[PDB]
Paper text:
To gain further insight into the function of NyxA and NyxB and their interaction with SENP3, we solved the crystal structure of NyxB at 2.5 Å. The asymmetric unit of the crystal contains 12 monomers of NyxB, but no significant differences were found between them and thus, only the structure of subunit A is described hereafter. The NyxB model encompasses residues 17–134, suggesting that residues 1–16 are flexible. NyxB has a mixed α–β fold with five β strands and six α-helices with a core made of helices α2–α4 and a small curved β-sheet formed by β3–β5. The longest helix α4 interacts with α2 and α6 and is connected to the core via a loop containing two short 310 helices designated α3a and α3b. In particular, a β-hairpin formed by β1 and β2 packs against α5 and anchors α1 to the protein core. Search for structural homologues (DALI server and EMBL fold) did not reveal any significant homology and thus makes of NyxB structure a prototype for this protein family. The association of dimer 1 (chains A and H) buries a total of 530 Å2, while dimer 2 (chains A and J) relies on fewer interactions burying a total of 400 Å2. Analysis of the NyxB surface revealed an acidic pocket delineated by residues Y66, D80 and E82 within an acidic patch consisting of amino acids D72, E73, Y70, Y86 and Y63, residues that are strictly conserved in NyxA. In the context of the dimer, these surfaces are juxtaposed to form an extended concave negatively charged area of around 2000 Å2.
Here we identify two Brucella abortus effectors, NyxA and NyxB, that interfere with host protease SENP3, and this facilitates intracellular replication of the pathogen. The translocated Nyx effectors directly interact with SENP3 via a defined acidic patch (identified from the crystal structure of NyxB), preventing nucleolar localisation of SENP3 at late stages of infection. By sequestering SENP3, the effectors promote cytoplasmic accumulation of nucleolar AAA-ATPase NVL and ribosomal protein L5 (RPL5) in effector-enriched structures in the vicinity of replicating bacteria. NyxA/B are two Brucella nucleomodulins impacting the subnuclear localisation of SENP3 and subsequently of other nucleolar proteins such as RPL5 and NVL.
Numbering used by the authors:
A (entry chain H), B (entry chain A): 17 to 133
Write the structure that this text describes.
């Protein structure tokens, strides 16, 4: 374990630790229109991120079987319900895995899937 | 057994039995636009109705605690999501309790609450 190593969250290990202790996370997208969020963003806005969360995935949250399911569900119901879906820039921690952009869904839809079910 | 005694579903006892045996129910509304349905309509379109279902309520399905919850849920999320909500004529089995109209929600919204949850 090295303190100075670059963490897969695209910051120093120390910075990752400070970020997690402050209740933050690295997976928020920039310039997300108000009332929208990405699945991964809303998930860690709700639940706690800890630096070792995606060690096995080398930081690629979008390999999480849990988050993939949520993403598939949100895509499905936003379409059948005629909801607006926005495209937003991926966070650096996902840009480094080849994900350039993410779908952002209405927060009410995320609330149903991520909190109620 | 009186086959011609009036059932609270607003048909003869015999008629209610025959309707139940054919997989029908008395709680559908007339002239519901395609892709919409009421809570009570969708519920019994999904699950089996039997004549004695609402003996205790003298046929007022909208006194069912479950169905009240589903209705409250759909009104809440239809509003927050900005979904279209239509007003439709109540079926006779509810007009007899003073309910003149029911709210009709998008079928996708009903699928979530009544089947997935």
């Amino acid at each position: 374990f090295d303190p100075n190593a670059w963490h897969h969250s695209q910051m120093t290990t120390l910075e990752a630790i400070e970020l997690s202790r402050s209740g933050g996370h690295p997976y928020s997208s920039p310039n997300v229109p108000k009332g929208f969020n990405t699945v991964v963003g809303f998930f860690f806005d709700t639940y706690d991120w800890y630096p070792a969360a995606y060690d096995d995935e080398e930081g690629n949250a979008m390999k999480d079987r849990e988050l993939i399911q949520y993403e598939d569900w949100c895509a499905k119901y936003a379409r059948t319900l005629g909801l607006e879906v926005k495209e937003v820039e991926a966070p650096a921690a996902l840009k480094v895995h080849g994900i350039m952009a993410l779908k952002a869904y209405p927060e009410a839809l995320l609330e149903i899937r991520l909190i109620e079910m």
